[PDB]
Design a protein around this ligand. Structure first.
Ligand SMILES: C[C@@H](O)[C@H](N)C(=O)N(CCCCCn1cnc2cc(Br)c(Cl)cc2c1=O)Cc1cccc(-c2ccc3c(c2)CNC3=O)c1
Ligand SMILES: C[C@@H](O)[C@H](N)C(=O)N(CCCCCn1cnc2cc(Br)c(Cl)cc2c1=O)Cc1cccc(-c2ccc3c(c2)CNC3=O)c1
Ligand SMILES: [Zn+2]
Ligand SMILES: [Zn+2]
Lengths: 401, 400
């Protein structure tokens, strides 16, 4: 269960010292990545998020106004052009605000949920890099919610439900939650912090979630909830975060027209559920030990013949699975069936549809799982329908009997 | 008029600001168009048997010096530093494709290798030469690199040519001008070039493509075919390029084991069809004047009521359309039908479905196009089936 080994074995990705902590995604690895994007994208639609794309770099002058510059200048990649310095974004928040500030905003437009698969870059020390876990070039399942103070509880509530919903898909039901409270050096009144910390607390209570405090461990611009998941080895991974921000909107001159017609500053909620797509793929790899659920599998089905006599049955059957939308390959090589099964089992293909003389004559197919189970000879159409159901529902488990 | 900058703001597709010169902020409706365009290309990538990869945002200046590109293009390259090492923010995806190829023992049977990528690229263009989505600093390339044998070239260039006219046809671009670039300075032998310039020439003749030679403007590393498509205003846009590279593979230690077990440096075909995804979206925005084909439209359908009596019938039809894979919104606002229909006609919504008492009673729906054509009250299921076909076929034309 090492993502760096399974990564080389299943030809998912590689990394080089010409680009430290920046992944080269091969075909099969990029297929897992994109299928994860499609999953999150379906949750963005379900939870009523917009999806945007922001530039890779912006003026240092803009990044200076955020108040992150002095603290994290050493971690930020810079580049120059025509006597102007540009930062390579390590965060998507300031870009999301620029999009928000285009056109006059109203109380009617809030809550405004702005998601992005934000390609971010951090100048992290090369010694502290490790595979897909610690990287320089990463992609966040990021979003920023612009809302009123009245709307915070409802929006954090929705973020909490979204976290547990998405984690359940991958079989993560043991979640540790930590609410980080006002730090010694903070912006805003104590009353603002009382309400904000309460808003996160009540939201967790409203979802019947037991949690604990990380005292004074909150950011200077507001308190945060952090979600830690436990894999099948009972190893703790901090992935999810819901962070309140009473600073950045004001800094970058974000405003809307209230119901009383008074120009107000929106509250910003920073939220990431998976956190780093690269790290989460890393975690899933070790979690499943290369046995990715069918919907994530780079190749979901290999249709294979015993002899040359079934070559055209395989081609017709491969075409049907293709048309059904299943990631299917044909193995028509001059090799024994045991060799074919052995090779595709090693590559962790969920299903191997074996076609012999008896399968052709009956219009059926023999299904073998990568675990080595034999489901017997089934009707071709009934099998496709079942594989479609297993993919559509993003099921963790394979076909029974 | 049909300015992509004006339409971009009107339909909330994109914005650009001085804090990021020649860099696009893709808003929700604009990012929807962008992604549908990616899905379209991916459908062609599957059809023409292309694998899809993703490369690093930046690589060491050492690698870009080995390519020979630093020499004359360093002034148009973005550079950053980390731990006393200089890195180049890539203006191209070619070197990164070779690194993926180099990882794994490549044989002659693994050729041809068709490696595609939506390559996030950056070049430091003069700020004065920037305009809209057409000339930018930060762009996205529908790029691919074909690793093939010297003999496989002509066939793999045919596929490329076929793929160009195929993809251009979808958006309704039939007027294409082609140019074969043959230079005083060059790598390798004159016999090599006599076959390389002929591989491109015969491929265009076989396909009955009239082309004009551009003697000199090719490259030292090999010749190129440039494709220029024409919009409804007869404006020229050089979008497609097919470039043969004999240098970069060898210069970046690329090799495959041949049929005779001899280590041969593979030939690299550089191909981009749309070119810049943002520029194409720019051309498309002006071509259609914001009236995007249904399959590209940010919002494809709006379902609306005449009174609060049909509100539930609307919410149900909305769900059935959403379940059918159609981008649909419901308009149950207390506004006159003429107000509603104008707003979605202004937003260039292909289809406006209106639900009156007569529509509810018959299980039907009144269909109006953004062109103002009243198609009348039709069976709900027959409409959804007709809309599905229009989207899944990527039809330029609406229901008449
Ligand atoms: C949730 C999202 O909207 C938010 N914007 C964000 O990105 N956050 C929230 C907390 C910020 C604390 C303060 N903080 C922390 N680190 C910084 C680093 C830099 Br550089 C700069 Cl300029 C600012 C900061 C900064 O404000 C950080 C965040 C959240 C989730 C995963 C990751 C994350 C995950 C994996 C990796 C990395 C980051 C870097 N290398 C990896 O391998 C980062
Ligand atoms: C087809 C694809 O695989 C190919 N590799 C490629 O990227 N090419 C073609 C090969 C010519 C090399 C000459 N050339 C031109 N400019 C450079 C700039 C830099 Br910086 C560097 Cl390092 C090298 C070069 C360089 O070799 C460049 C290419 C192809 C198609 C569209 C565009 C292109 C389209 C739109 C925009 C830009 C570029 C920049 N700003 C825009 O708005 C660029
Ligand atoms: Zn943020
Ligand atoms: Zn190239």
């Amino acid at each position: 269960r090492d993502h760096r080994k399974i990564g080389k074995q299943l030809d998912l990705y590689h990394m080089q010292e010409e680009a430290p902590g920046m992944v080269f995604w091969h075909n099969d690895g990029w297929t897992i990545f994109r299928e994860l994007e499609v999953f999150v994208r379906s949750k963005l639609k379900e939870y009523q998020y917009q999806e945007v794309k922001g530039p890779f770099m912006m003026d240092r002058v803009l990044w200076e106004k955020t108040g992150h510059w002095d603290n994290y200048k050493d971690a930020m990649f810079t580049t120059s052009s025509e006597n102007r310095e540009y930062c390579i974004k390590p965060m998507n928040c300031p870009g999301h605000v620029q999009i928000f500030n285009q056109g006059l905003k109203s109380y009617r437009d809030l809550p405004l949920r702005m998601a992005e698969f934000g390609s971010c870059h951090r100048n992290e020390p090369s010694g502290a890099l490790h595979g897909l876990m610690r990287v320089r070039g990463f992609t966040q399942d990021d979003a920023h919610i612009f809302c009123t103070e009245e709307q915070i509880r409802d929006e954090v509530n929705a973020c909490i439900r979204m976290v547990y919903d998405m984690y359940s898909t991958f079989g993560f039901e043991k979640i540790v939650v930590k609410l980080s409270t006002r730090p010694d050096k903070r912006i805003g009144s104590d009353e603002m912090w009382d309400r904000a910390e309460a808003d996160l607390a009540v939201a967790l209570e409203e979802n019947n979630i037991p949690f604990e405090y990380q005292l004074g461990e909150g950011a200077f611009y507001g308190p945060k909830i952090e979600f830690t998941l436990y894999d099948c080895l009972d190893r703790a991974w901090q992935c999810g975060t819901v962070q309140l921000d009473f600073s950045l909107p004001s800094r970058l001159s974000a405003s809307y027209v209230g119901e009383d017609n008074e120009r107000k500053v929106p509250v910003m909620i920073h939220r990431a559920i998976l956190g780093s797509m690269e790290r989460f793929i890393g975690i899933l790899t070790e979690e499943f030990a290369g046995f990715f659920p069918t919907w994530l599998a780079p190749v979901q089905v290999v249709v294979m013949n015993i002899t040359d006599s079934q070559s055209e049955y395989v081609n017709e059957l491969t075409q049907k699975l293709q048309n059904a939308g299943i990631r299917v390959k044909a193995d028509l090589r001059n090799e024994k069936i045991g060799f074919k099964i052995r090779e595709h089992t090693l590559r962790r293909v969920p299903y191997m549809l074996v076609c012999g003389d008896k399968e052709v004559e009956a219009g059926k197919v023999a299904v073998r799982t990568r675990r080595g189970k034999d489901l017997g000879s089934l009707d071709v159409n009934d099998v496709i329908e079942k594989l479609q159901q297993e993919i559509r529902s993003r099921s963790l488990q394979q076909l029974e009997e």
